[PDB]
Amino acid sequence: DAELKIFVSSQHQPDIWRKALDQYEAKTPGVKVVIETGGNTSEMQAQYLNTVMSAKDSSLDVLMLDVIRPAQFATAGWTSDFSGKDLSAYLPTYAEANTVNGKIVALPAFADSMFLYYRKDLLKYGIKPPTTWDELKEASKKVMEGELQGLSFQGKAIEGAVCTFLLPYWSEGKSLVEKLNFDNKAAVDSLKLWKSFVDDGISKKNISEVATDDTRKEFQAGKVLFAVNWSYAWTHFQGKSQVNDKVGVARLPAVGGEQTTCLGGWEFGVSAYSKQQDEAKKLVEYLSSQDVSKFMAINAALLPTYAALYKDADVTKTIPWFADALPVVETAKARPVTPRYNEVSETIRTTVNGVLAGVMTPEDGAKQMESRLRRVL
């Protein structure tokens, strides 16, 4: 007999998770689940977990958490581990994303990744989707000379700029955190690459001002040939928008390197202060099961955490473009898994934005980034 309280904020479709929870209660007699959205305002919801975990409040059982937080929350004492848990059935970088001190400390809820959205219509010039940044530059040169921004990416000092820095870093096969493993040449080459788009006229002069939804709105307005963005953008582009039926979805370019993207989306954890550990873990196992991932794809348009569901006929009938998402999500890489992710993110995004704004050079940016990451790690 358990009453389980689960934290799902108002921006994560708690209304659709509620339908999955109703199916769980109908076959799990004696378990009631109640959704806590975190308070009446957006700010209250964003401060909810810090409030009840700092108080060691034992009433919360299950929590949705960002894929960047597993290590921070486990190290803070906020989350329980799932002893002996196998994450091999999920998309491949979930095991790495959720293993902290050799323990599984969260389970996947729904996936996300960056995609290279592109104007399929303009590629008119006989160009196949670019597989390298040099191909993307050549492609942008051909389309722009023929006809409009070549490439929109996030240069504001936000989490998206960390993801931006890491795409060329990962493409060279480098991992920034394994403990800090800083490759100066790869870090300088990443910063120079993003700045080269501005210098070569492929990206606008003020890309340092571009947040995730600025890319989305500008591509949607027909002003962008190539756009880096996440899964939520597609429905905007195909909605009531000036790019209906002119949007392709591809893997992000490589630098002789590898085509990579970022592992995004959200996960579930169990509160370390829950008095109902076993029942809370069983609920998380259900919410992270393939049949629930499938339900959430069909009913909330959330990208599944199992590769097989991108080929499932019921999913692709409901959301055809998920077939085109699969080859991109299979290239995902995990952002640094560290309890000091906040400081690692702040240092990287500050450096990326400062180089793109023209406030510092790539070389001094790598210098500043290595110095600050060494203090944190």
mmCIF file of C-alpha atoms in Angstrom:
data_model
loop_
_atom_site.group_PDB
_atom_site.id
_atom_site.type_symbol
_atom_site.label_atom_id
_atom_site.label_comp_id
_atom_site.label_asym_id
_atom_site.label_seq_id
_atom_site.Cartn_x
_atom_site.Cartn_y
_atom_site.Cartn_z
ATOM 1 C CA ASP A 1 0.000 0.000 0.000
ATOM 2 C CA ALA A 2 1.831 3.123 -1.240
ATOM 3 C CA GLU A 3 0.935 6.696 -2.202
ATOM 4 C CA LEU A 4 3.747 7.828 -4.488
ATOM 5 C CA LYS A 5 4.310 11.534 -5.201
ATOM 6 C CA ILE A 6 6.043 12.235 -8.551
ATOM 7 C CA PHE A 7 7.482 15.619 -9.625
ATOM 8 C CA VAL A 8 6.640 16.424 -13.292
ATOM 9 C CA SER A 9 6.670 20.184 -14.017
ATOM 10 C CA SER A 10 4.016 21.943 -16.112
ATOM 11 C CA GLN A 11 6.224 22.082 -19.260
ATOM 12 C CA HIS A 12 6.654 18.245 -19.350
ATOM 13 C CA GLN A 13 3.067 17.232 -20.334
ATOM 14 C CA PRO A 14 2.040 15.961 -16.858
ATOM 15 C CA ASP A 15 -1.472 15.491 -18.386
ATOM 16 C CA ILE A 16 -0.104 12.697 -20.668
ATOM 17 C CA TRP A 17 2.132 11.102 -17.958
ATOM 18 C CA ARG A 18 -1.116 11.006 -15.874
ATOM 19 C CA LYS A 19 -2.622 8.574 -18.473
ATOM 20 C CA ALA A 20 0.438 6.257 -18.137
ATOM 21 C CA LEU A 21 0.148 6.462 -14.329
ATOM 22 C CA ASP A 22 -3.555 5.500 -14.532
ATOM 23 C CA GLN A 23 -2.560 2.337 -16.445
ATOM 24 C CA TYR A 24 0.060 1.552 -13.792
ATOM 25 C CA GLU A 25 -2.439 1.946 -10.909
ATOM 26 C CA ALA A 26 -5.040 -0.256 -12.707
ATOM 27 C CA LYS A 27 -2.598 -3.241 -12.728
ATOM 28 C CA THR A 28 -0.680 -2.421 -9.494
ATOM 29 C CA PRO A 29 -3.290 -2.769 -6.735
ATOM 30 C CA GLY A 30 -2.665 -0.666 -3.620
ATOM 31 C CA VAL A 31 -0.410 1.911 -5.384
ATOM 32 C CA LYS A 32 -1.752 5.451 -5.938
ATOM 33 C CA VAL A 33 0.428 8.020 -7.748
ATOM 34 C CA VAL A 34 -0.046 11.789 -7.408
ATOM 35 C CA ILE A 35 1.599 14.335 -9.717
ATOM 36 C CA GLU A 36 3.234 17.355 -8.077
ATOM 37 C CA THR A 37 3.937 20.045 -10.691
ATOM 38 C CA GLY A 38 6.068 22.054 -8.202
ATOM 39 C CA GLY A 39 3.967 25.165 -7.421
ATOM 40 C CA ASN A 40 1.797 27.864 -8.919
ATOM 41 C CA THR A 41 4.443 29.862 -10.853
ATOM 42 C CA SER A 42 7.218 28.856 -13.257
ATOM 43 C CA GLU A 43 9.845 30.135 -10.723
ATOM 44 C CA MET A 44 8.333 28.002 -7.919
ATOM 45 C CA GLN A 45 8.444 24.915 -10.165
ATOM 46 C CA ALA A 46 12.137 25.663 -11.021
ATOM 47 C CA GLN A 47 12.996 25.922 -7.251
ATOM 48 C CA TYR A 48 10.775 23.007 -6.033
ATOM 49 C CA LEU A 49 13.384 20.238 -5.941
ATOM 50 C CA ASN A 50 16.121 22.383 -4.284
ATOM 51 C CA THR A 51 13.545 23.354 -1.604
ATOM 52 C CA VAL A 52 12.345 19.860 -0.634
ATOM 53 C CA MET A 53 15.783 18.148 -1.028
ATOM 54 C CA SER A 54 17.603 20.858 1.028
ATOM 55 C CA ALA A 55 14.922 20.174 3.737
ATOM 56 C CA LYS A 56 15.393 16.339 3.375
ATOM 57 C CA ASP A 57 11.557 16.258 2.935
ATOM 58 C CA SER A 58 10.563 12.547 2.739
ATOM 59 C CA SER A 59 7.178 13.049 0.991
ATOM 60 C CA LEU A 60 8.560 13.097 -2.609
ATOM 61 C CA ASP A 61 9.099 9.633 -4.113
ATOM 62 C CA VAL A 62 9.947 10.085 -7.847
ATOM 63 C CA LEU A 63 11.283 13.080 -9.801
ATOM 64 C CA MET A 64 11.768 13.964 -13.453
ATOM 65 C CA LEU A 65 15.333 15.382 -13.924
ATOM 66 C CA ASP A 66 17.379 16.768 -16.839
ATOM 67 C CA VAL A 67 19.859 14.297 -18.413
ATOM 68 C CA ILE A 68 22.708 16.715 -17.386
ATOM 69 C CA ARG A 69 21.837 16.256 -13.602
ATOM 70 C CA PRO A 70 22.301 12.504 -12.692
ATOM 71 C CA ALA A 71 25.802 12.994 -11.212
ATOM 72 C CA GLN A 72 25.011 16.298 -9.409
ATOM 73 C CA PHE A 73 21.822 14.854 -7.786
ATOM 74 C CA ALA A 74 23.465 11.513 -6.760
ATOM 75 C CA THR A 75 26.542 13.313 -5.252
ATOM 76 C CA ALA A 76 24.256 15.837 -3.395
ATOM 77 C CA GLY A 77 22.455 12.891 -1.645
ATOM 78 C CA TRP A 78 19.174 13.651 -3.514
ATOM 79 C CA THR A 79 18.726 10.411 -5.517
ATOM 80 C CA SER A 80 18.868 6.646 -4.896
ATOM 81 C CA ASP A 81 20.786 4.134 -6.967
ATOM 82 C CA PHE A 82 19.267 1.216 -8.842
ATOM 83 C CA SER A 83 21.514 -1.601 -7.767
ATOM 84 C CA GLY A 84 22.296 -4.065 -10.615
ATOM 85 C CA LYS A 85 20.349 -2.061 -13.284
ATOM 86 C CA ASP A 86 21.045 -2.825 -17.010
ATOM 87 C CA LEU A 87 20.552 0.192 -19.375
ATOM 88 C CA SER A 88 21.808 -1.689 -22.481
ATOM 89 C CA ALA A 89 18.303 -1.886 -24.071
ATOM 90 C CA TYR A 90 18.061 1.919 -24.380
ATOM 91 C CA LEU A 91 19.878 4.150 -26.901
ATOM 92 C CA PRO A 92 23.567 3.441 -26.427
ATOM 93 C CA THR A 93 24.858 6.498 -24.522
ATOM 94 C CA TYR A 94 22.239 6.176 -21.736
ATOM 95 C CA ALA A 95 24.483 3.732 -19.772
ATOM 96 C CA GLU A 96 27.301 6.350 -19.705
ATOM 97 C CA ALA A 97 24.860 9.232 -18.950
ATOM 98 C CA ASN A 98 23.458 7.457 -15.821
ATOM 99 C CA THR A 99 26.493 5.642 -14.321
ATOM 100 C CA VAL A 100 27.933 7.606 -11.373
ATOM 101 C CA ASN A 101 30.580 5.977 -9.083
ATOM 102 C CA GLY A 102 29.747 2.672 -10.904
ATOM 103 C CA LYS A 103 26.025 2.952 -9.993
ATOM 104 C CA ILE A 104 22.893 3.628 -12.099
ATOM 105 C CA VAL A 105 21.329 6.773 -10.594
ATOM 106 C CA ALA A 106 18.479 7.593 -13.084
ATOM 107 C CA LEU A 107 16.473 5.889 -15.865
ATOM 108 C CA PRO A 108 15.538 7.429 -19.271
ATOM 109 C CA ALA A 109 12.151 9.183 -19.572
ATOM 110 C CA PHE A 110 12.259 10.582 -23.123
ATOM 111 C CA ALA A 111 15.056 11.424 -25.554
ATOM 112 C CA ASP A 112 16.191 14.498 -27.448
ATOM 113 C CA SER A 113 19.208 15.450 -29.588
ATOM 114 C CA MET A 114 20.441 18.190 -31.841
ATOM 115 C CA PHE A 115 19.571 17.762 -35.538
ATOM 116 C CA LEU A 116 20.840 19.496 -38.642
ATOM 117 C CA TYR A 117 17.553 20.878 -40.000
ATOM 118 C CA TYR A 118 17.967 21.995 -43.630
ATOM 119 C CA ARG A 119 15.984 23.574 -46.506
ATOM 120 C CA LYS A 120 15.566 20.453 -48.739
ATOM 121 C CA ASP A 121 14.228 22.709 -51.518
ATOM 122 C CA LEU A 122 17.458 24.805 -51.787
ATOM 123 C CA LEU A 123 19.799 21.779 -51.748
ATOM 124 C CA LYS A 124 17.792 23.322 -56.529
ATOM 125 C CA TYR A 125 21.615 23.359 -56.653
ATOM 126 C CA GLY A 126 22.032 19.538 -56.696
ATOM 127 C CA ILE A 127 23.678 19.348 -53.269
ATOM 128 C CA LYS A 128 23.413 16.228 -51.122
ATOM 129 C CA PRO A 129 23.126 17.036 -47.175
ATOM 130 C CA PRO A 130 26.603 17.931 -45.890
ATOM 131 C CA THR A 131 28.623 15.256 -43.952
ATOM 132 C CA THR A 132 31.551 17.600 -42.972
ATOM 133 C CA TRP A 133 31.668 21.281 -41.976
ATOM 134 C CA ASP A 134 33.754 21.917 -45.156
ATOM 135 C CA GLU A 135 30.885 20.356 -47.186
ATOM 136 C CA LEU A 136 28.440 22.572 -45.235
ATOM 137 C CA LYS A 137 30.549 25.670 -46.020
ATOM 138 C CA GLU A 138 30.831 24.714 -49.729
ATOM 139 C CA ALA A 139 27.090 23.986 -49.704
ATOM 140 C CA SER A 140 26.307 27.334 -48.062
ATOM 141 C CA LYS A 141 28.575 29.165 -50.588
ATOM 142 C CA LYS A 142 26.784 27.491 -53.612
ATOM 143 C CA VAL A 143 23.202 28.221 -52.318
ATOM 144 C CA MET A 144 23.972 31.739 -51.053
ATOM 145 C CA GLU A 145 25.756 32.778 -54.335
ATOM 146 C CA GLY A 146 22.819 31.304 -56.309
ATOM 147 C CA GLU A 147 20.004 33.066 -54.406
ATOM 148 C CA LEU A 148 19.233 34.177 -46.157
ATOM 149 C CA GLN A 149 21.650 32.817 -43.476
ATOM 150 C CA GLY A 150 23.854 29.807 -44.253
ATOM 151 C CA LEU A 151 24.026 28.374 -40.707
ATOM 152 C CA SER A 152 22.123 29.278 -37.502
ATOM 153 C CA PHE A 153 23.584 27.833 -34.233
ATOM 154 C CA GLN A 154 23.393 28.934 -30.573
ATOM 155 C CA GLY A 155 26.100 31.483 -29.617
ATOM 156 C CA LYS A 156 24.417 33.044 -26.526
ATOM 157 C CA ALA A 157 26.068 32.111 -23.167
ATOM 158 C CA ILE A 158 23.493 29.312 -22.596
ATOM 159 C CA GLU A 159 23.582 25.507 -22.264
ATOM 160 C CA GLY A 160 23.124 25.233 -26.076
ATOM 161 C CA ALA A 161 26.558 26.916 -26.605
ATOM 162 C CA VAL A 162 28.164 24.061 -24.561
ATOM 163 C CA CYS A 163 26.567 21.596 -26.960
ATOM 164 C CA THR A 164 27.859 23.761 -29.875
ATOM 165 C CA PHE A 165 31.467 23.639 -28.544
ATOM 166 C CA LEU A 166 31.322 19.873 -28.045
ATOM 167 C CA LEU A 167 30.136 18.850 -31.568
ATOM 168 C CA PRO A 168 33.621 19.407 -33.224
ATOM 169 C CA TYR A 169 35.446 18.349 -30.028
ATOM 170 C CA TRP A 170 33.592 14.969 -29.992
ATOM 171 C CA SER A 171 34.010 14.679 -33.824
ATOM 172 C CA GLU A 172 37.827 14.548 -33.289
ATOM 173 C CA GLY A 173 37.105 11.618 -30.889
ATOM 174 C CA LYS A 174 37.883 13.670 -27.788
ATOM 175 C CA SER A 175 36.009 13.529 -24.410
ATOM 176 C CA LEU A 176 36.476 16.541 -22.111
ATOM 177 C CA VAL A 177 35.675 14.644 -18.892
ATOM 178 C CA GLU A 178 36.478 10.978 -18.265
ATOM 179 C CA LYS A 179 38.354 13.931 -14.409
ATOM 180 C CA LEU A 180 39.420 16.635 -16.899
ATOM 181 C CA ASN A 181 41.107 15.461 -20.183
ATOM 182 C CA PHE A 182 41.611 18.834 -21.981
ATOM 183 C CA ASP A 183 42.919 18.720 -25.611
ATOM 184 C CA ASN A 184 44.067 22.311 -26.404
ATOM 185 C CA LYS A 185 44.222 21.828 -30.212
ATOM 186 C CA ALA A 186 40.674 20.306 -30.336
ATOM 187 C CA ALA A 187 39.297 23.101 -28.025
ATOM 188 C CA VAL A 188 40.986 25.887 -30.091
ATOM 189 C CA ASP A 189 39.854 24.182 -33.354
ATOM 190 C CA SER A 190 36.232 24.018 -32.136
ATOM 191 C CA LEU A 191 36.206 27.745 -31.190
ATOM 192 C CA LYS A 192 37.902 28.708 -34.495
ATOM 193 C CA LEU A 193 35.365 26.648 -36.470
ATOM 194 C CA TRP A 194 32.320 28.390 -35.017
ATOM 195 C CA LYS A 195 33.994 31.797 -35.442
ATOM 196 C CA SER A 196 35.002 30.871 -39.064
ATOM 197 C CA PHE A 197 31.283 30.687 -40.026
ATOM 198 C CA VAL A 198 30.914 34.346 -38.923
ATOM 199 C CA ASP A 199 34.215 35.396 -40.633
ATOM 200 C CA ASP A 200 33.330 33.519 -43.898
ATOM 201 C CA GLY A 201 29.791 35.139 -43.940
ATOM 202 C CA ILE A 202 28.110 31.677 -43.564
ATOM 203 C CA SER A 203 26.593 32.816 -40.201
ATOM 204 C CA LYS A 204 25.293 36.331 -39.277
ATOM 205 C CA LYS A 205 27.604 38.853 -37.484
ATOM 206 C CA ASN A 206 25.478 38.705 -34.234
ATOM 207 C CA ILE A 207 25.269 34.851 -33.834
ATOM 208 C CA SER A 208 26.585 35.556 -30.248
ATOM 209 C CA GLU A 209 23.009 36.790 -29.516
ATOM 210 C CA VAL A 210 21.218 33.622 -30.857
ATOM 211 C CA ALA A 211 19.339 31.410 -28.272
ATOM 212 C CA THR A 212 17.736 28.012 -29.117
ATOM 213 C CA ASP A 213 14.326 29.510 -30.044
ATOM 214 C CA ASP A 214 15.932 32.342 -32.151
ATOM 215 C CA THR A 215 17.358 29.636 -34.477
ATOM 216 C CA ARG A 216 13.882 27.968 -34.495
ATOM 217 C CA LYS A 217 11.961 31.176 -35.371
ATOM 218 C CA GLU A 218 14.507 32.334 -38.033
ATOM 219 C CA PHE A 219 14.610 28.980 -39.844
ATOM 220 C CA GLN A 220 10.794 28.859 -39.606
ATOM 221 C CA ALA A 221 10.660 32.336 -41.315
ATOM 222 C CA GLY A 222 12.583 30.933 -44.371
ATOM 223 C CA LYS A 223 15.770 32.877 -43.561
ATOM 224 C CA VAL A 224 18.095 29.931 -42.715
ATOM 225 C CA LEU A 225 19.569 27.209 -45.006
ATOM 226 C CA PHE A 226 21.000 25.019 -42.151
ATOM 227 C CA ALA A 227 19.794 25.142 -38.507
ATOM 228 C CA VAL A 228 21.093 23.336 -35.395
ATOM 229 C CA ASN A 229 18.132 22.569 -33.086
ATOM 230 C CA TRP A 230 16.286 19.990 -30.943
ATOM 231 C CA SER A 231 13.193 17.783 -31.567
ATOM 232 C CA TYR A 232 10.498 20.361 -30.524
ATOM 233 C CA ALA A 233 11.364 22.523 -33.657
ATOM 234 C CA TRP A 234 9.931 20.092 -36.289
ATOM 235 C CA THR A 235 6.208 20.586 -35.381
ATOM 236 C CA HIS A 236 6.760 24.421 -35.454
ATOM 237 C CA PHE A 237 8.269 24.176 -38.994
ATOM 238 C CA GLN A 238 5.340 22.025 -40.226
ATOM 239 C CA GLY A 239 2.739 24.151 -38.416
ATOM 240 C CA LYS A 240 0.642 27.226 -39.223
ATOM 241 C CA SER A 241 5.513 28.942 -40.468
ATOM 242 C CA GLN A 242 6.932 29.562 -43.992
ATOM 243 C CA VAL A 243 8.885 26.241 -44.431
ATOM 244 C CA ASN A 244 6.116 23.521 -44.600
ATOM 245 C CA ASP A 245 7.389 20.465 -46.631
ATOM 246 C CA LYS A 246 10.835 22.173 -47.257
ATOM 247 C CA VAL A 247 12.584 20.741 -44.126
ATOM 248 C CA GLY A 248 15.059 17.863 -44.176
ATOM 249 C CA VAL A 249 16.565 16.282 -41.038
ATOM 250 C CA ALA A 250 20.161 15.052 -41.106
ATOM 251 C CA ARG A 251 23.122 14.059 -38.867
ATOM 252 C CA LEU A 252 25.295 16.990 -37.728
ATOM 253 C CA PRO A 253 28.472 17.317 -39.826
ATOM 254 C CA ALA A 254 31.832 15.947 -38.783
ATOM 255 C CA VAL A 255 35.045 17.896 -38.835
ATOM 256 C CA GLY A 256 38.076 13.248 -41.180
ATOM 257 C CA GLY A 257 36.040 12.995 -37.974
ATOM 258 C CA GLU A 258 32.841 11.388 -36.686
ATOM 259 C CA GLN A 259 29.232 12.699 -37.087
ATOM 260 C CA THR A 260 28.050 13.374 -33.473
ATOM 261 C CA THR A 261 25.175 15.008 -31.635
ATOM 262 C CA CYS A 262 24.183 15.722 -28.034
ATOM 263 C CA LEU A 263 22.062 13.420 -25.820
ATOM 264 C CA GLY A 264 19.258 15.618 -24.420
ATOM 265 C CA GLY A 265 15.833 14.987 -22.904
ATOM 266 C CA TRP A 266 14.753 14.002 -19.389
ATOM 267 C CA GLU A 267 14.988 11.086 -16.946
ATOM 268 C CA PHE A 268 13.427 9.721 -13.766
ATOM 269 C CA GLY A 269 15.072 9.289 -10.375
ATOM 270 C CA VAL A 270 13.963 8.079 -6.906
ATOM 271 C CA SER A 271 14.319 10.503 -3.971
ATOM 272 C CA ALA A 272 17.036 9.309 -1.500
ATOM 273 C CA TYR A 273 14.674 10.585 1.253
ATOM 274 C CA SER A 274 11.632 8.577 0.060
ATOM 275 C CA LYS A 275 10.188 6.220 2.705
ATOM 276 C CA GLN A 276 8.889 4.006 -0.194
ATOM 277 C CA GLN A 277 12.138 3.073 -2.009
ATOM 278 C CA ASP A 278 10.996 -0.286 -3.468
ATOM 279 C CA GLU A 279 7.614 0.991 -4.751
ATOM 280 C CA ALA A 280 9.208 4.210 -6.123
ATOM 281 C CA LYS A 281 11.830 2.146 -8.043
ATOM 282 C CA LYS A 282 9.096 -0.163 -9.463
ATOM 283 C CA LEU A 283 7.194 2.904 -10.723
ATOM 284 C CA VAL A 284 10.358 4.273 -12.416
ATOM 285 C CA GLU A 285 10.948 0.835 -14.042
ATOM 286 C CA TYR A 286 7.387 0.990 -15.465
ATOM 287 C CA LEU A 287 7.651 4.633 -16.668
ATOM 288 C CA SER A 288 10.975 3.788 -18.414
ATOM 289 C CA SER A 289 9.638 0.536 -20.016
ATOM 290 C CA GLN A 290 9.464 0.300 -23.796
ATOM 291 C CA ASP A 291 5.649 0.027 -23.807
ATOM 292 C CA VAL A 292 5.445 3.369 -21.867
ATOM 293 C CA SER A 293 8.077 5.033 -24.097
ATOM 294 C CA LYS A 294 5.866 4.010 -27.036
ATOM 295 C CA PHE A 295 2.703 5.385 -25.329
ATOM 296 C CA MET A 296 4.521 8.723 -24.701
ATOM 297 C CA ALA A 297 5.707 8.911 -28.381
ATOM 298 C CA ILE A 298 2.161 8.403 -29.705
ATOM 299 C CA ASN A 299 0.307 10.537 -27.105
ATOM 300 C CA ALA A 300 2.838 13.351 -26.328
ATOM 301 C CA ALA A 301 5.153 13.306 -29.410
ATOM 302 C CA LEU A 302 8.185 12.652 -27.200
ATOM 303 C CA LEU A 303 11.196 11.002 -28.868
ATOM 304 C CA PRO A 304 11.532 7.416 -27.581
ATOM 305 C CA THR A 305 14.495 6.055 -25.560
ATOM 306 C CA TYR A 306 14.554 2.704 -27.494
ATOM 307 C CA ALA A 307 15.876 2.594 -31.071
ATOM 308 C CA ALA A 308 13.297 -0.063 -32.069
ATOM 309 C CA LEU A 309 10.371 2.358 -31.430
ATOM 310 C CA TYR A 310 11.639 4.683 -34.246
ATOM 311 C CA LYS A 311 10.768 1.750 -36.654
ATOM 312 C CA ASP A 312 7.456 0.787 -34.937
ATOM 313 C CA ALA A 313 4.542 1.089 -37.419
ATOM 314 C CA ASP A 314 2.202 2.642 -34.810
ATOM 315 C CA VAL A 315 4.789 5.316 -33.889
ATOM 316 C CA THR A 316 5.703 6.165 -37.543
ATOM 317 C CA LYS A 317 1.983 6.287 -38.554
ATOM 318 C CA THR A 318 1.430 8.902 -35.811
ATOM 319 C CA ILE A 319 4.790 10.814 -36.207
ATOM 320 C CA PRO A 320 6.378 10.010 -39.579
ATOM 321 C CA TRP A 321 9.530 12.150 -39.089
ATOM 322 C CA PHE A 322 10.677 9.937 -36.178
ATOM 323 C CA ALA A 323 11.942 7.536 -38.912
ATOM 324 C CA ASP A 324 14.306 10.370 -40.037
ATOM 325 C CA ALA A 325 15.292 11.170 -36.368
ATOM 326 C CA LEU A 326 16.662 7.631 -35.672
ATOM 327 C CA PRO A 327 19.989 7.890 -37.615
ATOM 328 C CA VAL A 328 20.640 11.240 -35.814
ATOM 329 C CA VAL A 329 19.807 10.088 -32.258
ATOM 330 C CA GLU A 330 22.070 6.997 -32.794
ATOM 331 C CA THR A 331 25.052 9.444 -33.064
ATOM 332 C CA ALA A 332 24.366 11.017 -29.653
ATOM 333 C CA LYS A 333 27.156 11.597 -27.136
ATOM 334 C CA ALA A 334 26.759 12.299 -23.411
ATOM 335 C CA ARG A 335 27.747 15.685 -22.102
ATOM 336 C CA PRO A 336 30.416 15.530 -19.291
ATOM 337 C CA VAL A 337 29.090 13.355 -16.442
ATOM 338 C CA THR A 338 30.206 15.267 -13.327
ATOM 339 C CA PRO A 339 28.598 16.663 -10.155
ATOM 340 C CA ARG A 340 30.201 20.039 -11.029
ATOM 341 C CA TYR A 341 28.326 20.188 -14.383
ATOM 342 C CA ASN A 342 27.007 23.711 -13.515
ATOM 343 C CA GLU A 343 30.539 25.155 -13.322
ATOM 344 C CA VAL A 344 31.786 23.154 -16.339
ATOM 345 C CA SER A 345 28.797 24.477 -18.418
ATOM 346 C CA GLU A 346 29.285 28.067 -17.232
ATOM 347 C CA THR A 347 32.980 28.060 -18.154
ATOM 348 C CA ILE A 348 32.394 26.599 -21.662
ATOM 349 C CA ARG A 349 29.365 28.729 -22.605
ATOM 350 C CA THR A 350 31.139 31.917 -21.379
ATOM 351 C CA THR A 351 34.145 31.146 -23.596
ATOM 352 C CA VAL A 352 32.068 30.224 -26.705
ATOM 353 C CA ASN A 353 29.925 33.375 -26.479
ATOM 354 C CA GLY A 354 33.027 35.623 -25.796
ATOM 355 C CA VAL A 355 34.819 34.315 -28.917
ATOM 356 C CA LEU A 356 31.666 34.694 -31.100
ATOM 357 C CA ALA A 357 31.008 38.213 -29.737
ATOM 358 C CA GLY A 358 34.589 39.270 -30.713
ATOM 359 C CA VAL A 359 35.553 39.883 -27.045
ATOM 360 C CA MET A 360 38.379 37.295 -27.119
ATOM 361 C CA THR A 361 40.340 35.055 -29.489
ATOM 362 C CA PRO A 362 39.982 31.214 -29.840
ATOM 363 C CA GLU A 363 43.471 30.675 -28.326
ATOM 364 C CA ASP A 364 42.814 32.847 -25.280
ATOM 365 C CA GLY A 365 39.342 31.229 -24.998
ATOM 366 C CA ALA A 366 40.909 27.718 -24.800
ATOM 367 C CA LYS A 367 43.450 29.152 -22.237
ATOM 368 C CA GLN A 368 40.613 30.659 -20.096
ATOM 369 C CA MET A 369 38.479 27.465 -20.488
ATOM 370 C CA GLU A 370 41.352 25.077 -19.470
ATOM 371 C CA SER A 371 42.362 27.335 -16.501
ATOM 372 C CA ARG A 372 38.707 27.480 -15.189
ATOM 373 C CA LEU A 373 37.953 23.711 -15.798
ATOM 374 C CA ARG A 374 41.204 22.883 -13.901
ATOM 375 C CA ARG A 375 39.964 24.924 -10.859
ATOM 376 C CA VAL A 376 36.569 23.060 -10.999
ATOM 377 C CA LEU A 377 38.009 19.534 -11.712
#
